[PDB]
């Protein structure tokens, strides 16, 4: 019996109850980024950069 | 019996009840970034940079 | 018995109940990116960069 990195539970979401009673919702983007309404999200990156709800307006690396 | 890094529980979300009764919601982005409404999010990055709700207006690395 | 990286549970979502009673929803994008309404999403990247709800306005790497 070793259990090397075993029996784990990593990047987990459970038992999530959500109610969203919105009468009006409105997003207006003019250039750039808009991230809206991320719910119950699970990730596990290995040897990499992992974002979830990142937003960047605009990367301008001219020349 | 070793249990090296085992039996763990890392980056976990559970038992989340949420109610959002909003009559009006409005996002207006003009250039740049807007991140709105991240709920019950779990991540586990290894050997990497992990953001969740990052927002950057604009990276301008000219030349 | 070794259990090297075994018996795991990584990047998992379960037991998610959601109700979204919205009377009106409206997204207006003019150039750029809009990400809206990601729910119950699970990922596991290995040796790579894994985003989930990323948004970038525009990459302009002229010359």
């Amino acid at each position: 019996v070793l259990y090397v990195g075993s029996k784990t539970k990593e990047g987990v979401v459970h038992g999530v109850a959500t109610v969203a009673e919105k009468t009006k919702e409105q997003v207006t983007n003019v250039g750039g980024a808009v991230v809206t309404g991320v719910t119950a999200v699970a990730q596990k990156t290995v040897e990499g950069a992992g974002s979830i709800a990142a937003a960047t307006g605009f990367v301008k690396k001219d020349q | 019996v070793l249990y090296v890094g085992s039996k763990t529980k890392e980056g976990v979300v559970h038992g989340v009840a949420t109610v959002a009764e909003k009559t009006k919601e409005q996002v207006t982005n003009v250039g740049g970034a807007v991140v709105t409404g991240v709920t019950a999010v779990a991540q586990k990055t290894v050997e990497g940079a992990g953001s969740i709700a990052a927002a950057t207006g604009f990276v301008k690395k000219d030349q | 018995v070794l259990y090297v990286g075994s018996k795991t549970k990584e990047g998992v979502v379960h037991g998610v109940a959601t109700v979204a009673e919205k009377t009106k929803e409206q997204v207006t994008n003019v150039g750029g990116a809009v990400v809206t309404g990601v729910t119950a999403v699970a990922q596991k990247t290995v040796e790579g960069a894994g985003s989930i709800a990323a948004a970038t306005g525009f990459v302009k790497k002229d010359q």
Partner: peptide
């Protein structure tokens, strides 16, 4: 020459 004008004249 990034420009992101926007108006909401009602």
């Amino acid at each position: 020459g990034v420009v992101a004008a926007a108006e909401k004249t009602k």
